[model samples]
Target: CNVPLGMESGRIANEQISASSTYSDGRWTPQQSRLHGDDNGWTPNLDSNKEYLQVDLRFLTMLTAIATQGAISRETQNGYYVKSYKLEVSTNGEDWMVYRHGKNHKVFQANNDATEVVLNKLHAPLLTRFVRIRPQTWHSGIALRLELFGCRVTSGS
Candidate 1:
């Protein structure tokens, strides 16, 4: 299992501000996406492009993996979801680095049913204080129940 050793780590969610291309509901704003609640999720404005959802993880940490979910359910498949995405990390809030690129990986798909997609299976870890998810393509547009999986770190001097 490539599950990250986070969740128990201190979360900066309340202290951090959120940014997103669109949102379907105020309750599910990018801020709520961190709650790990499935129904409370983030959705982009319909037919949007170059959409993203980002977080200010607050402290430097070793990001082991990331997980995302689609809005699709049994009765409907029309809702949009990310088809491909790239992850970027930052420390100073301005300069950023790509942790994963859509071009480097295949189309990560989610169907009519709510699905969770995990990035990095025991893959190399990324160290950063911020994280951003940029969707390169979508089924209609990106709808996400997003969660960043990782652990905080303390580098020896």
Candidate 2:
């Protein structure tokens, strides 16, 4: 079943999300990466490929889809959104595995503009606790608002 993993409603605690860097003092921190977030959203310190936004699911769950949006500056209304990104998952949080489409790592098509939401479904559901979004291309700057979708799985997974 596809259901929001709580980024929008704040069920996913602020401490459960993190980023490789933040723009200013914590203004664009990972916790701001929620869909429809009023804050500035997650904007890394640098607009480089080295940056990533990570979230912790707390339990092994089936991740079926992901959605992303760009941040529109409240003052200037300028758009800042990612064009493409790579997805990675981890069972234990240390060793990460890139989600692949067959033999190659999937480079997901992301938002074309800052305000519109873009959703991408996985070829197969992933059972993991940690998910990371690595932006490959961005517009203006690397900014993201996102949501994870899936349902709980039995421990047998």
Candidate 3:
């Protein structure tokens, strides 16, 4: 049996996208859907060069009895290079924790290659309601194509 992990919908096809926020200071706030925007896609905030693309998993609940895995597939546009991309998770919107943190935590990094980043074998004791895909470093003029998928495993139980 196949179970739905998450759904994605948007107008812009090749740019930054993020999940919405659901809480404020540990309390439940307004619920919203995942959004895709390009207005500030490449441009970073004045204080930091890092541009954030976020997502909201307020409705997504991971059963502790089951295992979970997520995959992100994307191809770089012709003539552009991909530096690196990282998968991050957050329970509270303020603090973020990296999944599979290590020296080679990078999912994908290429100077000029088209490849997909898959983060499989993920286990979460608590339900993860917020997920983010951050492109740590990338060259200019490169467009990222990405599709994320999550799977539930019943083998452990």
- The best candidate by lDDT is 2
lDDT of each: 0.59, 0.91, 0.37
Error of 3 at 78 (Å): 7.8
Clashes of 2: 0
Number of residue pairs clashing in candidate 3, backbone atoms closer than 3 angstroms, sequence gap of 3 or more or interchain: 7
Which sections of candidate 2 miss by over 4 Å?
none
Write one digit per residue (lDDT tens) for candidate 3, span 1-157. 2233433344222223343322223221111112121111222222121433355545444523211111122222233223555566665667777656456463544233323322233344434555655555555432233333444333332
- lDDT of candidate 2 at residue 82, scale 0 to 100: 97
lDDT of 2 by residue, 1-157 (tens): 7999999989899999998888876668888899999877899998998899999999888999999999987767788999999999998999999988789989999999998899999888888899999999999999999999998788873
User: In model 1, where do residues sit more than 4 Å from their true spots?
Assistant: 1-12, 15-17, 24-28, 35-40, 46-49, 72-78, 100-112, 117-119, 155-157
Better of 1 and 3 by TM-score: 1
Best-to-worst ranking by TM-score? 2, 1, 3
lDDT of 3: 0.37
C-alpha-based local distance difference test score of model 2: 0.91
TM-score, cand. 1 vs. native? 0.70
Name the candidate, 2 or 3, with the larger lDDT value.
Answer: 2
Q: Estimate each model's TM-score.
A: 0.70, 0.95, 0.43
Instruction: Give per-candidate clash totals.
Output: 0, 0, 7
Give the best candidate by TM-score. 2
